[PDB]
Design an enzyme around this catalytic site. Structure first.
Site, PDB file in Angstrom:
ATOM      1  N   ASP A  55      30.426 -20.943  -6.585  1.00  0.00           N
ATOM      2  CA  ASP A  55      29.015 -20.630  -6.786  1.00  0.00           C
ATOM      3  C   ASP A  55      28.545 -20.650  -8.235  1.00  0.00           C
ATOM      4  O   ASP A  55      27.503 -21.224  -8.540  1.00  0.00           O
ATOM      5  CB  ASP A  55      28.702 -19.268  -6.183  1.00  0.00           C
ATOM      6  CG  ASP A  55      27.361 -19.228  -5.531  1.00  0.00           C
ATOM      7  OD1 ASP A  55      26.856 -18.101  -5.289  1.00  0.00           O
ATOM      8  OD2 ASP A  55      26.812 -20.316  -5.249  1.00  0.00           O
ATOM      9  N   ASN A 102      39.951 -16.334  -3.806  1.00  0.00           N
ATOM     10  CA  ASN A 102      38.702 -15.953  -3.162  1.00  0.00           C
ATOM     11  C   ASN A 102      38.185 -17.004  -2.180  1.00  0.00           C
ATOM     12  O   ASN A 102      37.895 -18.108  -2.574  1.00  0.00           O
ATOM     13  CB  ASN A 102      37.628 -15.646  -4.213  1.00  0.00           C
ATOM     14  CG  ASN A 102      36.290 -15.288  -3.581  1.00  0.00           C
ATOM     15  OD1 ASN A 102      35.364 -16.084  -3.588  1.00  0.00           O
ATOM     16  ND2 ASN A 102      36.196 -14.090  -3.025  1.00  0.00           N
ATOM     17  N   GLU A 103      38.117 -16.638  -0.903  1.00  0.00           N
ATOM     18  CA  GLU A 103      37.473 -17.460   0.130  1.00  0.00           C
ATOM     19  C   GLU A 103      38.099 -18.839   0.355  1.00  0.00           C
ATOM     20  O   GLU A 103      37.383 -19.827   0.437  1.00  0.00           O
ATOM     21  CB  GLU A 103      35.976 -17.595  -0.172  1.00  0.00           C
ATOM     22  CG  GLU A 103      35.196 -16.322   0.102  1.00  0.00           C
ATOM     23  CD  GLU A 103      33.708 -16.551   0.164  1.00  0.00           C
ATOM     24  OE1 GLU A 103      33.007 -15.671   0.710  1.00  0.00           O
ATOM     25  OE2 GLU A 103      33.243 -17.614  -0.328  1.00  0.00           O
ATOM     26  N   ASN A 151      34.479 -10.835   2.423  1.00  0.00           N
ATOM     27  CA  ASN A 151      33.165 -11.298   1.946  1.00  0.00           C
ATOM     28  C   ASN A 151      32.214 -11.580   3.137  1.00  0.00           C
ATOM     29  O   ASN A 151      32.375 -12.552   3.904  1.00  0.00           O
ATOM     30  CB  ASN A 151      33.307 -12.558   1.094  1.00  0.00           C
ATOM     31  CG  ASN A 151      33.948 -12.289  -0.278  1.00  0.00           C
ATOM     32  OD1 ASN A 151      34.240 -11.143  -0.650  1.00  0.00           O
ATOM     33  ND2 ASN A 151      34.154 -13.366  -1.050  1.00  0.00           N
ATOM     34  N   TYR A 177      28.787 -11.549   2.614  1.00  0.00           N
ATOM     35  CA  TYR A 177      27.569 -12.136   2.081  1.00  0.00           C
ATOM     36  C   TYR A 177      27.338 -13.375   2.927  1.00  0.00           C
ATOM     37  O   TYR A 177      28.300 -13.970   3.409  1.00  0.00           O
ATOM     38  CB  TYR A 177      27.754 -12.494   0.609  1.00  0.00           C
ATOM     39  CG  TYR A 177      26.472 -12.877  -0.100  1.00  0.00           C
ATOM     40  CD1 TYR A 177      26.105 -14.218  -0.235  1.00  0.00           C
ATOM     41  CD2 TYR A 177      25.628 -11.908  -0.641  1.00  0.00           C
ATOM     42  CE1 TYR A 177      24.925 -14.589  -0.886  1.00  0.00           C
ATOM     43  CE2 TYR A 177      24.448 -12.265  -1.290  1.00  0.00           C
ATOM     44  CZ  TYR A 177      24.104 -13.608  -1.407  1.00  0.00           C
ATOM     45  OH  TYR A 177      22.949 -13.976  -2.058  1.00  0.00           O
ATOM     46  N   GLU A 198      32.134  -8.320  -0.576  1.00  0.00           N
ATOM     47  CA  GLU A 198      30.824  -8.963  -0.831  1.00  0.00           C
ATOM     48  C   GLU A 198      29.810  -8.694   0.278  1.00  0.00           C
ATOM     49  O   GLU A 198      30.080  -8.952   1.468  1.00  0.00           O
ATOM     50  CB  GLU A 198      30.970 -10.468  -1.031  1.00  0.00           C
ATOM     51  CG  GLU A 198      31.502 -10.863  -2.370  1.00  0.00           C
ATOM     52  CD  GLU A 198      31.355 -12.362  -2.646  1.00  0.00           C
ATOM     53  OE1 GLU A 198      30.411 -12.971  -2.105  1.00  0.00           O
ATOM     54  OE2 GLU A 198      32.171 -12.934  -3.405  1.00  0.00           O
ATOM     55  N   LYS A 228      21.255 -12.917  -6.710  1.00  0.00           N
ATOM     56  CA  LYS A 228      22.088 -12.117  -5.813  1.00  0.00           C
ATOM     57  C   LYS A 228      22.259 -10.731  -6.353  1.00  0.00           C
ATOM     58  O   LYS A 228      22.823  -9.873  -5.698  1.00  0.00           O
ATOM     59  CB  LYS A 228      23.460 -12.778  -5.617  1.00  0.00           C
ATOM     60  CG  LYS A 228      23.374 -14.279  -5.417  1.00  0.00           C
ATOM     61  CD  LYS A 228      24.630 -14.863  -4.825  1.00  0.00           C
ATOM     62  CE  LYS A 228      24.394 -16.336  -4.482  1.00  0.00           C
ATOM     63  NZ  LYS A 228      23.517 -16.459  -3.260  1.00  0.00           N
TER      64      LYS A 228
END
Lengths: 597, 596
Positions: free
Chosen positions: A165, A408-409, A462, A464, A500, A564
């Site tokens: 991101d 992450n992710e 997460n 979000y 998140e 955000k």
């Protein structure tokens, strides 16, 4: 390798991060062929360091640039420094950096967010001024952490593409210094602190001294001695009172001296005495259930990109302290050590996180097999492990760090995902047995499709983008969210942290319909999450996605670097800030609210 | 007290603006009585320096605090400094600071924008660590520069009241540094640059150092020695065509040595070959007509207060370079030295001003007479002199400073205004004849009302609020403006610089009616100013009032620090920016546009 934080204790350093350096863009990539490190940077301009280079010049072409850039600066060595083992260190050069002190290459490094240092004693002289040239590269590929794909158009003009991101800011984001140690003792320490029933307990010591006998002294906040140990390494001394607690973070000082026949070296290391451990669905800090509150942050601000700044740091911590945040997570990369130092002193618990984002091609000429020689491969894995190593080597001693986050992710659906992460998980555990391990989970890899989470200790979710898929329906969102959380609980029976949760919110945009992008919506959204959290026993923490609005990569689901944050980029608060302030401060410190009370 | 900007050679220094000191408030004012410097600050918290203390903590009670605050920090003195002389310097402590090392009181200073340094060798051991404590005061009174009044309400709470626009940010705004000099040289140097014609002229050397015979070598940009002198002072040199010009700003270097049997020392200074002359109605840098373009600025930013910052400075200059500004004015106080060095290095001309604002009670429990003993007494005039003194002491060698400013927007209406300033105008010329001099004129004190302009070399006029007095009428204002301009011209036949012009403008406000506070209005406003400028031969300078939105004093008129900038506080451009860009880059460099 061995990584200690340069501190002054009959050890010395001279900040080089006076930021005024000579800066140049190597558009044609001639710099290396033409040995730019030998003479003055031609047609250079003044730049500041620490700081990203992208936004300093209000110029789009410099900001979006990809490839090589050159930093250059002259410096005098302290005369007193004659035969004293001089080392030049860069706390962080984002992505790639190669260094020349006067035509002599001393350094090369691949990670954007960890320090590297080299002994330059034989290339420098006490009373002389030396030229320091740094070549910095901001290009990402499948073997870098985080991954990326440069796209070269027909014209041979590079174009960085990536799968995370935040904007790909580059340059010397952190302090660059020149420091001094006795020829006797250099570069490593490791500490472990055990605790029983908050009655007494010991501190396992061990370190290398680079050819010296080491004595160890544990000192108070009062600077009084409380325990001693000669054991060169493997020192173990019992203590009787003061635990490091999230609220306060009481710190001890470990004085490690290294006795040579002639030279002496003394290193102070701050020590927090606390145990971190998962037990069932609880996350225990000194055998006490702890409840995380706080943010996923980002090293981001207005003209300085990810460049570090003392003012920003003091302010943001004053906000977090006000809002009642008791924790945060270094979202998507390792933070400046000064951040962890602060945490240590104030008792801020931290989830320390690698730069391993964008291992996912499923978040919108891309490879079809994510885990493939063409894409994320054995070399990539090796780069990942290396990233894990340098982070741990840097942060193993901070009491604030209660957990390691490996990535992450990542997309964990495809075959090859578990083949890739099982080795990684194992390695990090051996690297540090003291801290629980985790890997932040993407939404679409839910309890029924994810294939990796069992390899980790605590479940970080997460969530979000629950408003994307749920199309902004709260009624529906609450039912689906509670369903998925309970499913995760029954599957792993691990502690669950929502790492998140939040919504893009345009500051000033108010709506009576409480709809998407309005301050009122951000409140309703967050509030719906908190309600289900208090209903799920396995949930032991809640970290709102984004403390503050940050810049992002170019896109359609992107609104001016995106919004955000609970706070704006200039740190002004949106309505949701006060909502959080109320929930977090009304809460018994570190205690999970009973079923909403 | 002499002033030399520290620089590294066989001369060294260690910045201690390592940014985090212990910090505490002294609400109870027990600090000095309880000897707080003796031990570690209790009940303290972390603060960053350089920076204002006001906005670092997102707390109103700290933000609006008046009285004393405490800074404390420990530091190791480098071991290679033993026999050499060790000195502690502060680039700036805003308003008042006094210093204790361990328990030894070494320092005191008033004037929040100038350096002060003390030899601390006896109270320092090379090998050891020393505790530095600073008591910072932000209070202003009538003897203070800038003037003020503190209301300690019956409750015993102190409230600072002052008469200028910007917020009263305080704290340690600039670098703090220990530095090394051998025993052979202490603080002083001077240089002048006569340039009579197209090819070459002279550079009058001057130098003052204790225990030192002086060498004084000159140098090129290529490090080639192009002239030398031997005299401790009075040296002089003649060179060839290499002019410091506002376009590029070519610099030279003067290496300076002071020497003894025991120890030796070479200080390096930079030199710009430029001449600053006022010929009738024209301003001159090297025998040529210049036209100022730029801004009145401020040292202000989010979070930091007036604290210095490199990213901040690099960016702003990028913007100024882009926008086409060739000049600016340190508005209402002395800027960071780095700014001048930058200007010197880039060829940016700087109208340099002092912290002398608020001398006016007209623009709005106060004294009825401006220049009474109750307000601006003789005791104030000395403080003023002191402040003008020290500025010149640290800026006289900077090529970029083409002009001095002794004050901003003083009230000249009251009887006995000239009695206060005539001495200061004349006195300052004796401190520097090298550069011309100006006083910035409030609007309402026009040629007919104002009684002081005659004592100044070029006229500096603040036409900001031209929108307020004309109730937003452009048709009227333009007429009143031009007429008022010519009145000033034939009265003093002087070069006229407009030091302030612009209008409150809320970013993101657009209007078909082009009415006040709208980005369109700002453009329309600035345009009507430009036209009259083009038609008046006397105007040698224009500078838009405020580069960027800044924080002001708590104000009813104030709207988010009142939004007077071309850019927002976070450096985002308003429509006006694109207009000033187009005009300023659409004209020959330093050249006034033809009769428009």
């Amino acid at each position: 390798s061995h990584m200690l934080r340069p501190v002054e204790t009959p050890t010395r350093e001279i900040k080089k991060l006076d930021g005024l350096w000579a800066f140049s863009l190597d558009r044609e990539n001639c710099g290396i062929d033409q040995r730019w490190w030998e003479s003055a940077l031609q047609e250079s301009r003044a730049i500041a360091v620490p700081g990203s280079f992208n936004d300093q010049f209000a110029d789009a072409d410099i900001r979006n640039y990809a490839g090589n850039v050159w930093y250059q600066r002259e410096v005098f060595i302290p005369k007193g420094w004659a035969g004293q083992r001089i080392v030049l260190r860069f706390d962080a050069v984002t992505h790639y950096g190669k260094v020349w002190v006067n035509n002599q290459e001393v350094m090369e490094h691949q990670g954007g967010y960890t320090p590297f240092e080299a002994d330059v004693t034989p290339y420098v002289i006490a009373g002389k001024s030396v030229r320091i040239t740094v070549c910095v590269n901001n290009e990402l590929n499948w073997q870098t952490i985080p991954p990326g794909m440069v796209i070269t158009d027909e014209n041979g003009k590079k174009k960085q593409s990536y799968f995370h991101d935040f904007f790909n800011y580059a340059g010397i984001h952190r302090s660059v210094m020149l420091y001094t140690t006795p020829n006797t003792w250099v570069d490593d320490i490791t500490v472990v602190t055990h605790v029983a029933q908050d009655c007494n307990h010991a501190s396992v010591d061990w370190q290398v001294v680079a050819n010296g006998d080491v004595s160890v002294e544990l000192r108070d906040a009062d600077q009084q001695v409380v325990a001693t140990g000669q054991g060169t390494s493997g020192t173990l001394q019992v203590v009787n009172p003061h635990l490091w607690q999230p609220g306060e973070g009481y710190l001890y000082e470990l004085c490690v001296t290294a006795k040579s026949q002639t030279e002496c070296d003394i290193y102070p290391l701050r020590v927090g005495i606390r145990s971190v451990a998962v037990k069932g669905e609880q996350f225990l800090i000194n055998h006490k259930p702890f409840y995380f509150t706080g943010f996923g942050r980002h090293e981001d601000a207005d003209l300085r990109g990810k460049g570090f700044d003392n003012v920003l740091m003091v302010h943001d911590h004053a906000l977090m302290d006000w809002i009642g945040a008791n924790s945060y997570r270094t979202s998507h990369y390792p933070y400046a050590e000064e951040m962890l130092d602060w945490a240590d002193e104030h008792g801020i618990v931290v989830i320390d996180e690698t730069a391993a984002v964008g291992f996912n091609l499923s978040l919108g000429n891309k490879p079809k097999e994510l885990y493939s020689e063409e894409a994320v491969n054995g070399e990539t894995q090796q780069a990942h492990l290396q990233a894990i190593k340098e982070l741990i080597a840097r942060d193993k001693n901070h009491p604030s760090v209660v957990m390691w986050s490996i990535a992450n992710e990542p997309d964990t659906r495809p075959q090859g995902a578990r083949e890739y992460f099982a080795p990684l998980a194992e390695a990090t555990r051996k690297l540090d047995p003291t801290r629980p391990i985790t890997c932040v989970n993407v939404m679409f890899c839910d309890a029924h499709t994810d294939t990796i989470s069992d390899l980790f200790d605590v479940l970080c979710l997460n969530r979000y983008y629950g408003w994307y898929v749920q199309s902004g329906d709260l009624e529906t969102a609450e039912k689906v969210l509670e369903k998925e959380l309970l499913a995760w609980q029954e599957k792993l029976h691990q502690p669950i942290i929502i790492t998140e949760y939040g919504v893009d919110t345009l500051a000033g945009l108010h709506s009576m319909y409480t709809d998407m992008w309005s301050e009122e919506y951000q409140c309703a959204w967050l509030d719906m999450y908190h309600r289900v959290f208090d209903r799920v026993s396995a949930v032991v923490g809640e970290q709102v996605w984004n403390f503050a609005d940050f810049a992002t990569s170019q896109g359609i689901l992107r609104v001016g670097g995106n919004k955000k944050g609970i706070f704006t980029r200039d740190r002004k608060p949106k309505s949701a800030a006060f909502l959080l302030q109320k929930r977090w401060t009304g809460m018994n410190f570190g205690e999970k609210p009973q079923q909403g009370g």
